[model samples]
Target chain A: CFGQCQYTAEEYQAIQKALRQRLGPEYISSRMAGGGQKVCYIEGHRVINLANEMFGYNGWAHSITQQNVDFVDLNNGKFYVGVCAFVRVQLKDGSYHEDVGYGVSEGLKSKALSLEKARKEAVTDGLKRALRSFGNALGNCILDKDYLRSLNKLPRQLPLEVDLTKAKRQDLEPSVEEARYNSC
Target chain B: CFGQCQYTAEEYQAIQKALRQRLGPEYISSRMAGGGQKVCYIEGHRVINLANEMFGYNGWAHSITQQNVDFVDLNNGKFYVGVCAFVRVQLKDGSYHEDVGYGVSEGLKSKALSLEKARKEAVTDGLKRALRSFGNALGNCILDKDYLRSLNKLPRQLPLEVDLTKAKRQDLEPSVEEARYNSC
Candidate 1:
């Protein structure tokens, strides 16, 4: 629903530089999204780290589960479950926007995981998709997809990896409702 | 959310018999929804009539304008506009369910009608879809579908139609506060 990330060219470029430097040579995986289109995924943990890094010491991500639907797939011979989630990030200017995502998993050969795990996974997935929308992460898929196409060559590789253990460990700040939902 | 029309087999049969006797032979059109899917339509007026006749008159349909968006296609050199509508049907037992439908009209070539006509059409389109949801009037879409399928040998020819002008319409009832928003 929004145009693009809030950051200016210089700010966006700098953030991309930072993320590249952090992710290093360990590239995210990309998968076929049908119809010859491919989509890339960032690990849930990596997305959180990038958001905390980019949003500043005060930045955070949050998710809310809107609904859960479960049923028995008589034909599939397993339990089917899915969650609809809304995830958002705080803007530097203090306003907010949200992204919606759905996650479905089956059990008993398809009960992918417990409902709780699926909920977390769905929220995390939505948040990651939303966060990456800003940092030009995952090739800026959430927005500015046109530019991604122009880069026919391999996407510029990240700035190279770093040893987080060697870097000074910083205490990540928590949001007001941290205890209730640890999405960030 | 319930399945099948509210009536039992004998009751549904009697109602159909009553309607068949009432409506007589100049049928409303049902068109191909494509991929060989045939959808019969009840004119906005007929849907209301059927509801009152079959449901003992507690029926109604309503609509709320959700959004309207219009634009120009500079390259195609035309004007286009559309509306997203939410329409609901009130059941015999007195509950409601709404469906969303979007209708777009263009100017020049394929612009079959003016904006006003398009708006009404879209609202009607949405309302009909929603009305079919309940186990009530316009016959239950899913359940009636099996009946419709059984008559596939001549699905195009309705059982009958009538001289709407000659039919005597009883005094129609009104709902709480006009229910004028009634899409039907």
Candidate 2:
């Protein structure tokens, strides 16, 4: 019990099934780019929420092992900040994943604010990359080569028109995965 | 040009036309929601870049007037932080716009990091809201009822699958508007 977590055969199988599940489309955010291209992303909060749902809240954790402001520019009433971050996500079973991410913000009016934005962005980016290795549920699906290659075959989905006044943060339910599995 | 900017009829007309121009979809990012819906957003850096493009770099600025951590919960191996911020955007001509924004970060392992995320998000949110009143180029169009109602009629654009290895930050040229109007 003191060493790495030892899961029963049943427990191990259950965990494997949980991690391999495909991510739902609702959790994937698509940003349309120029030339009919779009970028797919999973926000950092939703990633964390999925992890908590897969493993117990205390069953997994991540540490920011390295971080720094890699670049800065403040001139002519303009500012820029770039940050690099390395993060490690570890499970109770003693397995871990690590990755590096870089983030930049420019044209902000304040130097301090720009730095904060870049640093946070870097950490979130790193966290997503590291977690992505765990499985599709953790966001590896978006990285799959075949899945990406099929974009042309799949039609894009547009947002539906909803009353702006009725749209509130509270109305939005919990993360899709968490809502699906509330037992844990 | 003393107490308040007294624009010539031509100058005023030009400025109004510039500000009212519809924001390009390229500058907007969309996050798909549950039930065939999506949330549209413009990044803070993009907003700042647009202001610089429209009103020279030195022509406009935003100041954070008030800010505080309105909520914090660090218990049970979990953390949540919420921040409230008030920002004022001012033009060299003495006209100004003000608004408040709130931001939150949860499920982070560190409390300090959570606070930083929430604060920066709040400031950016406030900055965008304050700037939105300036008109379309400032991102007011996305909030317009008629525009919001037209989402279904407009098809979503999807991201193209270029080699992932080639998609680097350096490859993304300068902001679209900045590249379009580089004479300044």
Candidate 3:
């Protein structure tokens, strides 16, 4: 649950430039044999451009992410970069599951075919199917509207009210008032 | 959490009739010294009405109220009667700083009064004060819309996709058709 990363602007720029150089300019737009795109720069200028267009960069992402990065001193001279891939699944039954895998490499070297292959295999085979099954089961039982409505129909009783003044003066004798003030 | 009750329909009708006869119609509507009217019949009617409305017969009321009355046996010349109460509270948190109490009794008698009194005392003494303080504390933490807007400015990463098939294959390995199969 606990994880951290640090990267300077210089390091980030170098990493992006190296990635573009190795993968070629068409890397971001190129499609693989499979339905999805092959490789794309995830965290650099592209993300900023999308964010600016969608939310104007004057939204929550601006403050929280900025504060998180700045407070941790990511721009310092000596820093570490940690990269990982995460897969999230929504099962047919309405449950969600997630899995994360990590890799380390210098500059753009981390984007090697081996790492990409491993991440895709992990997401599809290890996470998605299992999560989907869980979601399906949860949706059938817990999220079913009829079942929830039946539960709500059960009668709920309100707490009763009492007149304390009348109760105190009732025939019952005080069991401990005398003992409290006197030792006996 | 588990409790038991035993009664008959004749007994239930007898008790209610007795209560009405003893208390009289004037007492039923007359305002008591406290703020509310006696309105005891409202509660009584509620019990009878619920039993009849829900169970399709008032006979179920005898079983629920545990009223003592004569029941004539058609198979053999005999009669039976029984008595019990309709409501109960089984749990009470009476330890230090936790002032809660519970009980059960005949609805026609003092059960409602007892439970209501206990709850009222608990609310007046400490529960109300504690809840008020909690609400005030929560109100102070409310942030302005502009404060929330300021939170949106931060850097973020875009989701990336990877291709699995292109990553790894052994060049030296023979193709599937070149290998001998058990079936073949």
Runs of candidate 1 with Cα error greater than 4 angstroms are A1-28, A34-37, A70-76, A106-117, A132-145, A150-152, A155-184, B1-184
Chain A TM-scores, one per candidate?
0.56, 0.75, 0.20
Q: List the residue pairs that clash in candidate 2.
A: A37-B158, A37-B159, A38-B158, A38-B159
Clashes of each: 14, 4, 28
Tell me the fnat of candidate 1.
Answer: 0.00
RMSD of 3: 37.6
Ranking by TM-score: 2, 1, 3
DockQ score of each predicted structure, in the order shown: 0.01, 0.01, 0.01
Encode model 3's per-residue lDDT on A1-184: one tens digit a residue.
0011122234323322221111112112222422344422222243233223221222102110000000111223322232233333321111122222232222233334434443343333223211211211111112222323333343433434655875565564656666666755
Model 2 Cα lDDT, one tens digit per residue, A83-136: 666676766544454545556676789888888888998899878866764565
Query: Best lDDT goes to which candidate?
Result: 2
Q: Candidates sorted by lDDT, descending order?
A: 2, 1, 3
TM-score for candidate 3 = 0.14
Task: Output the better candidate (2/3) by TM-score.
Answer: 2
